[PDB]
Design an enzyme around this catalytic site. Structure first.
Site, mmCIF file in Angstrom:
data_model
loop_
_atom_site.group_PDB
_atom_site.id
_atom_site.type_symbol
_atom_site.label_atom_id
_atom_site.label_comp_id
_atom_site.label_asym_id
_atom_site.label_seq_id
_atom_site.Cartn_x
_atom_site.Cartn_y
_atom_site.Cartn_z
ATOM 1 N N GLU A 11 0.769 -1.236 0.000
ATOM 2 C CA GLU A 11 0.000 0.000 0.000
ATOM 3 C C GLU A 11 0.807 1.296 0.000
ATOM 4 O OE1 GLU A 11 -3.004 0.147 -0.476
ATOM 5 O OE2 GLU A 11 -3.796 -1.852 -0.094
ATOM 6 N N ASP A 20 -6.357 6.659 -5.048
ATOM 7 C CA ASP A 20 -5.890 5.287 -5.166
ATOM 8 C C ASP A 20 -5.896 4.826 -6.630
ATOM 9 O OD1 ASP A 20 -8.426 4.170 -5.663
ATOM 10 O OD2 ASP A 20 -8.658 3.228 -3.731
#
Ligand SMILES: [Cl-]
Ligand SMILES: [Cl-]
Length: 162
Positions: A11, A20
């Protein structure tokens, strides 16, 4: 290697609101803020999550605090889920980390949708499950991360992360 280090590699860490891979407003270690297009709606969720007026920026400690909550929520969601629990229970420690990773990225509903692969993991048919997990939008959208997770499932070791 452990779940925390594994997810931190997948991540990354960002202290400023960002988008994202799907285009949603996120902060810290993969903490989804909102699916809404509004940066304002995102800043609002952020402040609510942190308990302070942040103006879109948080500290390392704050990011880690969200991260600890999210991993805990992921684990507790798996164990409460009738479709997921039996799978998780059947797995060794490494593979359990890989399952948590999927859940953290795609939500419980999403993973629960991989019916065929779940049946295969439960039966310990590693190679077949790896082939089936690859036939998914998940794998096509984030291929490098998916391959890492899939390899963990196939091998039962942390090699992809080493
Ligand atoms: Cl929250
Ligand atoms: Cl990727």
């Amino acid at each position: 290697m452990n779940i925390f280090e594994m997810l931190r590699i997948d991540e990354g860490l960002r202290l400023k609101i960002y988008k994202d891979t799907e285009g949603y407003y996120t902060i810290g270690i993969g903490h989804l803020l909102t699916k809404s297009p509004s940066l304002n709606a995102a800043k609002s969720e952020l402040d609510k999550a942190i308990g302070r007026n942040t103006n879109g920026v948080i500290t390392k400690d704050e990011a880690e605090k969200l991260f600890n909550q999210d991993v805990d929520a992921a684990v507790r969601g798996i164990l409460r889920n009738a479709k997921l629990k039996p799978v998780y229970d059947s797995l060794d420690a490494v593979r359990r980390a890989a399952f948590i990773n999927m859940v953290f990225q795609m939500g419980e509903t999403g993973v629960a949708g991989f019916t065929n692969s779940l049946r295969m993991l439960q039966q310990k048919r590693w190679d077949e499950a790896a082939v089936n997990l690859a036939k998914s939008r998940w794998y096509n959208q984030t291929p490098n991360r998916a391959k890492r997770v899939i390899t963990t499932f196939r091998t039962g070791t942390w090699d992809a992360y080493k």
